[PDB]
């Protein structure tokens, strides 16, 4: 079952999501979604999707049940059996995705920041904690 | 053998910027500081002066503008100890700086100077820095 956390103050520039976890001995992939509602198929302002089995990291958004243009990151800053700490940082012009001690990708806003209400973490990952700062 | 830090921020900092500071407060420590400065000159204006004072058990927040300090704000107690490592997040938002210490929200410092003026991060005083990263 995917982990879900509400954003009680919504998200604004300055909102920081810290996700600590572990990638299982062989995970295929896992994802972090920033969702605009609790209903099934709700829009995703951000879909962050490390894929171990294809060695990619896909970024996308979704509206009206339709994915958008995929953006991909440089390499795979995740490995099976190793713990991670991801920061998702909301700025005025996009989301900064930080893995470890390095800026990994910058994803420009497609949907209004204000519509975001939910963080979802699913797929093959062992979730240690989701913290919102 | 204190280990300080100076980093330039040529493009400045925008709402949604994270300064992560990790280090050790050494056994004899009196105090240390994290400054967000507007220039490289001596006594530059400061959007943020963050000042854990181990010797007085206070954490002071202030700004400096046109050469004059503002009114100090104080956080709730001192989440630092001599002989112990720490992690501080200084998070810039639309309305101010959020200080996070040891994974807990600690203080919120409303902007006094425009964020666009910040040009430099300096960390010094009685601290042995592990790392300073800006995201
Ligand atoms: O956009 C995010 C979503 O991606 C899909 S998977 C997706 O399916 C697409 C079908 O048109 C393409 O096959 C796409 N694609 C494109 C490429 C591609 C194309 C050109 C160059 C190069 F390097 C790669 N490879 N795969 C693939 O990623 C997931 O099911 C969903 O959960 C979510 O992550």
Residue numbers in the entry:
A (entry chain B): 3 to 135
B (entry chain A): 1 to 135
Question: Could you share sentences copied from the article?
Answer:
Galectins are small, soluble lectins characterised by conserved β-galactoside-binding site (subsites C and D) within their carbohydrate-recognition domains (CRD, ~130 amino acid residues), and they can form multivalent lattices with membrane-associated glycosylated ligands. All the observed CRDs of galectin family adopt a typical β-sandwich fold composed of two antiparallel β-sheets of six strands (S1–S6, S-sheet) and five strands (F1–F5, F-sheet). Concave surface of S-sheet contains conserved amino residues and forms a primary binding groove to which specific glycans up to a length of tetrasaccharide are bound. In this model, the best structurally characterised subsites C and D are responsible for recognition of the β-galactoside-containing disaccharides, whereas the other subsites (A, B and E) remain poorly understood regarding how they contribute to ligand binding interactions.
We therefore prepare TDG, TD139 and TAZTDG (C2-asymmetric, containing one 4-fluorophenyl-triazole at C3) and study their binding interactions with human galectins-1, -3 and -7 by X-ray crystallography, isothermal titration calorimetry (ITC) and NMR spectroscopy. We show that a great number of interactions between TD139 and galectins-1 and -7 exist in subsite E than in subsite B, and that TAZTDG displays two binding modes toward the galectins, with a preference for subsites C–E in galectins-1 and -7 and subsites B–D in galectin-3. Especially for galectins-1 and -7, subsite B is less important for binding than is subsite E. Thio-digalactoside moiety of TAZTDG is thus supposed to bind with subsites C and D of galectins-1 and -7, and their E subsites accommodate the 4-fluorophenyl-triazole moiety, which would be consistent with the observed enthalpy change between TDG and TAZTDG (ΔΔHTAZTDG-TDG = −4.5 and −2.4 kcal/mol for galectins-1 and -7, respectively). The signal patterns are similar to those observed in the TD139 complexes, indicating that the fluorophenyl-triazole extension of TAZTDG can bind to both B and E subsites in solution in a similar manner as di-substituted TD139 to simultaneously occupy both sites. The area covered by each distinct resonance in the spectra of TAZTDG complexes also reveals that TAZTDG prefers the subsite E-binding mode when in complex with galectins-1 and -7, in agreement with the complex structures previously mentioned. Interestingly the subsite B-binding mode is dominant in the case of galectin-3. These galectin-specific binding modes are further supported by additional X-ray crystal structures of TAZTDG in complex with galectins-3 and -7. In the case of galectin-7, the chemical shift perturbations could be extracted by monitoring the crosspeak positions as a function of TAZTDG concentration, although coalescence is observed for several crosspeaks with intermediate ligand-to-protein ratios, leading to the unfavorable line broadening during titration.
